[PDB]
Amino acid sequence: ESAWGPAATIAARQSATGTKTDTPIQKVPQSISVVTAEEMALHQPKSVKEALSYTPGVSVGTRGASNTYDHLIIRGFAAEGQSQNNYLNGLKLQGNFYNDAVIDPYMLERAEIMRGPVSVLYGKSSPGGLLNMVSKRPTTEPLKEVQFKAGTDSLFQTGFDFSDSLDDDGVYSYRLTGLARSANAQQKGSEEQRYAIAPAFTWRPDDKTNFTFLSYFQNEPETGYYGWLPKEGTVEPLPNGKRLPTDFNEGAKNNTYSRNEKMVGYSFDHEFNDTFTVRQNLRFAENKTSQNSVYGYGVCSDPANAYSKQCAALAPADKGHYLARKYVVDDEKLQNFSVDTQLQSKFATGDIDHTLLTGVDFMRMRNDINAWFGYDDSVPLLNLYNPSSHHHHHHGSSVNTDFDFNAKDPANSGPYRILNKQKQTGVYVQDQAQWDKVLVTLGGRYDWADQESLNRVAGTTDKRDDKQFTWRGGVNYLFDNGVTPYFSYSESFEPSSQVGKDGNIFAPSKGKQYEVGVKYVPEDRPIVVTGAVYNLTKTNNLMADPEGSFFSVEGGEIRARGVEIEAKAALSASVNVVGSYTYTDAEYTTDTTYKGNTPAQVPKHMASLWADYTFFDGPLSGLTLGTGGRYTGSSYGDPANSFKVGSYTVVDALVRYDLARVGMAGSNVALHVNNLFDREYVASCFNTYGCFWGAERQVVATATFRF
Numbered sequence: 191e192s193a194w195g196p197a198a199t200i201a202a203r204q205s206a207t208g209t210k211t212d213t214p215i216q217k218v219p220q221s222i223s224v225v226t227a228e229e230m231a232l233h234q235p236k237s238v239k240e241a242l243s244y245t246p247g248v249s250v251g252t253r254g255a256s257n258t259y260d261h262l263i264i265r266g267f268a269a270e271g272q273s274q275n276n277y278l279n280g281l282k283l284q285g286n287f288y289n290d291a292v293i294d295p296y297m298l299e300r301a302e303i304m305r306g307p308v309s310v311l312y313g314k315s316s317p318g319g320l321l322n323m324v325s326k327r328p329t330t331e332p333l334k335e336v337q338f339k340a341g342t343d344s345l346f347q348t349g350f351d352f353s354d355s356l357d358d359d360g361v362y363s364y365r366l367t368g369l370a371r372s373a374n375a376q377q378k379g380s381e382e383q384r385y386a387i388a389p390a391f392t393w394r395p396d397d398k399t400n401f402t403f404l405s406y407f408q409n410e411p412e413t414g415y416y417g418w419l420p421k422e423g424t425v426e427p428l429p430n431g432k433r434l435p436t437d438f439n440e441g442a443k444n445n446t447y448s449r450n451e452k453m454v455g456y457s458f459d460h461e462f463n464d465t466f467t468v469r470q471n472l473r474f475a476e477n478k479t480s481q482n483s484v485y486g487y488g489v490c491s492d493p494a495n496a497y498s499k500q501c502a503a504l505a506p507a508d509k510g511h512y513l514a515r516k517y518v519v520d521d522e523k524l525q526n527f528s529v530d531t532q533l534q535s536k537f538a539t540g541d542i543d544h545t546l547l548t549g550v551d552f553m554r555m556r557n558d559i560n561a562w563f564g565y566d567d568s569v570p571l572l573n574l575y576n577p578s579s580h581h582h583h584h585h586g587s588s589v590n591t592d593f594d595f596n597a598k599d600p601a602n603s604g605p606y607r608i609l610n611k612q613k614q615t616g617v618y619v620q621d622q623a624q625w626d627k628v629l630v631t632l633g634g635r636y637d638w639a640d641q642e643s644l645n646r647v648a649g650t651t652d653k654r655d656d657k658q659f660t661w662r663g664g665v666n667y668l669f670d671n672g673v674t675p676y677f678s679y680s681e682s683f684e685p686s687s688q689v690g691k692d693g694n695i696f697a698p699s700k701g702k703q704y705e706v707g708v709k710y711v712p713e714d715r716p717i718v719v720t721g722a723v724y725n726l727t728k729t730n731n732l733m734a735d736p737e738g739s740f741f742s743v744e745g746g747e748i749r750a751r752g753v754e755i756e757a758k759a760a761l762s763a764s765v766n767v768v769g770s771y772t773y774t775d776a777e778y779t780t781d782t783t784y785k786g787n788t789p790a791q792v793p794k795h796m797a798s799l800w801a802d803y804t805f806f807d808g809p810l811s812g813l814t815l816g817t818g819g820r821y822t823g824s825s826y827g828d829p830a831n832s833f834k835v836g837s838y839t840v841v842d843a844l845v846r847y848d849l850a851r852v853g854m855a856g857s858n859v860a861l862h863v864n865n866l867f868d869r870e871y872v873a874s875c876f877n878t879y880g881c882f883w884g885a886e887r888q889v890v891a892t893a894t895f896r897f
């Protein structure tokens with residue numbers, strides 16, 4: 191009935207991120223979720239992150255109110271370094287250090303999250319999973335959209351989406367999506383600004399051929415808050431019994447953070463005859479980032495400030511209500527090129543049909559870093575006692591003061607100049623073989639992953655080339671009542687970039703996952719229900735030197751066993767629901783300093799559930815009301831597990847009015863409120879000095895008009 195209904199449910203039955211062939215989800219041997227454009231058009235997520243909010247096995251809010259990155263912890267793990275493991279159009283948006291790129295969800299057609307290992311199809315990748323976003327492409331029918339938004343915290347967004355054919359047959363079409371946004375961050379003194387234009391052009395010379403040029407250009411002068419808060423004044427009280435308020439900001443007042451993104455590429459597909467289709471996906475990007483940032487580093491009483499002179503210089507009983515701060519100045523610039531070429535051969539073997547994928551994937555990334563870091567006594571301290579007042583929780587925080595980012599005292603501060611390079615060439619093969627009600631997926635990939643690192647300050651150079659194989663295989667049994675039981679085994683690998691006591695770069699870490707579960711994907715009614723349970727293991731995790739040095743040592747091992755269930759269904763033509771539940775038991779299996787502990791930021795239990803009700807009768811016709819709940823279980827705030835961050839439940843809702851009924855059909859007006867009950871929670875902590883206030887209640891009005 192309404193866009194995000196079953197038209198959405200069913201469009202999402204289909205995917206490709208999991209097999210690199212266009213396959214429906216019950217024929218996919220691995221856990222995979224899909225979120226459609228109609229859905230983001232309903233929910234209006236600030237980022238790709240919120241877009242996956244009702245999906246299992248993923249924490250999307252770890253960093254709370256910050257929006258700088260779309261970082262996701264999946265099935266308990268994150269990538270080498272805490273780097274994003276994000277794809278756009280099947281190709282990796284490879285970043286490095288603070289140079290990580292994001293794509294606005296207004297420019298997306300869909301997003302898919304693939305859980306567990308997938309090196310079998312993409313190369314070095316985090317066990318845990320990967321995120322694949324898909325660019326809006328030119329439309330068959332015309333589209334002329336203009337959208338306006340006004341919200342709390344001074345959000346003003348203006349954007350458009352126009353697509354048309356240049357000929358009546360449509361061999362030529364384009365799309366141009368753009369947006370201008372600005373708001374002030376939840377934290378006092380921080381703002382956000384974004385400018386983004388995505389020009390796309392499709393060429394279908396006929397119907398067995400498609401070349402779509404995909405481009406994206408984004409400028410962000412200000413990215414906003416990305417600071418660190420002590421568990422003291424957030425999770426826990428300050429010695430005075432109080433807390434830092436949710437809008438508090440430990441940074442300078444002249445803290446500045448910016449990103450620049452430009453990309454050009456294309457998606458290409460050509461079906462030659464009945465057995466041979468070829469597709470090539472390619473992209474080039476040049477992205478940049480800068481920042482001047484003063485950041486928190488815990489209270490003076492925190493182990494991490496043992497050696498801080500401004501901290502030792504205080505009354506023992508004060509140490510725990512004062513804040514050590516550091517800083518960084520960064521300038522970076524990277525280029526990333528990618529091409530994946532694949533040949534799909536469909537054919538039979540008697541009563542056995544095959545879809546045989548064979549392809550070569552390549553990328554190179556270069557990132558040039560030139561920064562400077564304040565060490566132990568590089569910046570003033572802060573008394574969290576004034577901040578802590580009820581005055582402030584009530585009449586707001588107060589900006590701090592400037593900070594000379596140029597006076598770089600060699601005393602307490604240093605330069606960091608690195609030039610990183612990565613290359614990976616992989617060849618993979620896979621077959622989806624179906625013999626009646628059996629679908630068997632199996633293939634493997636081999637990778638040449640080479641890196642090189644130059645340290646311009648030490649004038650030194652670290653290199654390592656890895657050579658890796660990974661494979662995966664599984665079966666999905668297809669029952670026509672709509673029941674697809676499946677299971678499989680899969681792997682992934684990930685090079686280290688760290689260097690050990692012997693002056694060398696450690697070896698790769700690896701991913702090993704056993705998964706089984708079933709998928710209820712009924713062809714008659716608009717419902718999808720999936721359930722899965724899995725054993726995922728990461729080996730060769732870098733750990734602490736059993737012998738007290740400043741180097742890590744390898745051989746560590748972490749395990750995540752878990753359960754995930756997702757469910758989406760139209761319940762009546764006016765009621766739709768979607769929701770999930772996740773159970774993740776993650777464990778340090780082999781570790782110098784932590785066997786038995788669970789890793790920070792990952793809850794044992796999480797869940798979410800959403801419902802929308804649309805009204806087609808009476809005088810409330812074309813009025814949608816929806817509301818949802820997101821449950822985040824308790825979690826540890828440090829590898830030591832010395833403390834815990836608590837469970838929370840945020841409630842979101844909207845009311846949308848289908849303007850249609852005043853002529854303007856296809857237009858609509860909406861009102862969205864996130865964290866309806868304006869709850870105060872700490873999102874997570876990655877350590878005792880690294881904590882994050884969750885997002886305080888937001889209100890946004892959106893008017894989207896279709897000419």
Ligand SMILES: CCCCCCCCCC[N+](C)(C)[O-]
Pocket residue numbers: 529531550552613615
């Ligand atoms: C159909 C075009 C395929 C392009 C393949 C790109 C080759 C990259 C070669 C670089 N390498 C390090 C492997 O020699």
Ligand SMILES: CCCCCCCCCC[N+](C)(C)[O-]
Pocket residue numbers: 769770771795796797798799821823824837
């Ligand atoms: C739609 C499913 C809702 C599931 C909510 C699950 C909460 C499990 C809580 C376990 N607990 C935190 C009490 O230990």
Ligand SMILES: CCCCCCCCCC[N+](C)(C)[O-]
Pocket residue numbers: 797798799819820821837839
């Ligand atoms: C949207 C699902 C909401 C589930 C809420 C679960 C609350 C569990 C409360 C018990 N506790 C967290 C304290 O263990």
